[PDB]
Amino acid sequence: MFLQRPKPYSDESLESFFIRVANKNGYGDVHRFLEATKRFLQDIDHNGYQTFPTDITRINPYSAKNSSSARTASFLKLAQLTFNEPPELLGLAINRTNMKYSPSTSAVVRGAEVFPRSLLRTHSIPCCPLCLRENGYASYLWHFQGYEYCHSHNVPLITTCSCGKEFDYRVSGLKGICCKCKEPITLTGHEAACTVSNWLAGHESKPLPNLPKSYRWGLVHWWMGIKDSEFDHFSFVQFFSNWPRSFHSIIEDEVEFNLEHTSELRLKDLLGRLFFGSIRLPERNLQHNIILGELLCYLENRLWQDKGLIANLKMNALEATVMLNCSLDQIASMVEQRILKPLDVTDYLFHFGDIFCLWLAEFQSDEFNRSFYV
Ligand SMILES: [Zn+2]
Ligand SMILES: [Zn+2]
């Protein structure tokens, strides 16, 4: 097999790339090219040929339960071997990662971009026919919730042709023609959804903040947990048009609420959802995690006010590990040499003020450090 590489586009989905390779190189459709690829990997006896996917909806390494590394090895082999000129294959693939978004959400990665798994579309991938007809390839962005309008054409993305037969470019191709009715698909205008889409695509879109892409998706994920429902594009842009006082109001309303409803006060009692919901969006880089950065700034300045209400709030060993990004052994190790003064991992032995100062004294990194909110 010697394939001709189609013209590269950095924002192309892996599926669209394989469809264009199949088209350019004379294969009937992408499924026939995948079967032929699997057959070639067998002919050269490639250790993972047997698990190479023939279903275009399962081609990404995240779709492989246990053969994800055989999958990436096959992509590297193909990109290095079967082409006139090496293509960027690995760079288009969506991989699992072990990173997380607080409190408990897993993640995927494409190139250097990390996404919360909650936003990864589970069923039918929408498209923009204007992009398909105009450019001839599909965008990786269509795979992720929150990007609901095309940032280039400003129209909602489409899931279904007018005939109720859902259109999925992975199975029904890159021209934007309906399978069943054989008609080209048509569209169906919120300003707030457009801003978010342009922002998630990586472009400056005021009043949304200029953060690395992984942290933009983190903010979508964070707002969904704050609003406790699917992403509300309107109130999200409204939130950042009044930033930072909009967030200072969320913090102040929250602590006042819990004070109304004293030595027993735990950090989770006063600020539970807010604090542990913000730690990893996806990491504690305070230049980029502006939620955690603003929260720590607000807490540092209110530390000893009101007879130390903030500083005396009680914490677990478990919660101190999530704050400091250390292990449980190190907590017990600091207890013994009396670096940290209070074993029981669930007992609320420690004070936020001590944990905060310990962070400053022993656990600041080049990213997780107070200088970014100063
Ligand atoms: Zn478009
Ligand atoms: Zn139709």
Numbering used by the authors: 1 to 188, 193 to 265, 270 to 350, 360 to 391
Sentences from the paper on this structure:
Recently, bioinformatics analyses have revealed the presence of CRISPR–Cas loci in bacterial Tn7-like transposons, thereby implicating a functional relationship between RNA-guided DNA targeting and transposition, with the latter representing a new role unrelated to host defense. Support for this concept has emerged from recent functional studies on type I-F and type V-K effectors involved in sequence-specific DNA transposition, thereby significantly broadening the potential biological applications of CRISPR–Cas technology. To complement the available functional studies, our efforts have focused on structural studies of the Vibrio cholerae Tn6677 multi-subunit type I-F CascadecrRNA–TniQ complex, whereby transposition subunit TniQ initiates DNA transposition with the eventual help of other transposition-associated proteins TnsA, TnsB and TnsC in the gene cluster. Here we report cryo-EM structures of a V. cholerae type I-F CascadecrRNA in complex with transposition subunit TniQ before (binary CascadecrRNA–TniQ) and after (ternary CascadecrRNA–TniQ–dsDNA) target double-stranded DNA (dsDNA) binding at an average resolution of 2.9 Å and 3.2 Å, respectively.
We also determined the crystal structure of apo-TniQ at 2.1 Å resolution, demonstrating that TniQ forms a head-to-tail dimer with a dimeric interface of 1931 Å2. Superposition of the TniQ dimer in the cryo-EM structure of ternary CascadecrRNA–TniQ–dsDNA complex (in color) with the crystal structure of the apo-form (in grey) reveals minimal conformational changes with an RMSD of 1.19 Å; the loop interacting with Cas6 becomes ordered and the helix interacting with Cas7.1 undergoes slight movement (circled in green).
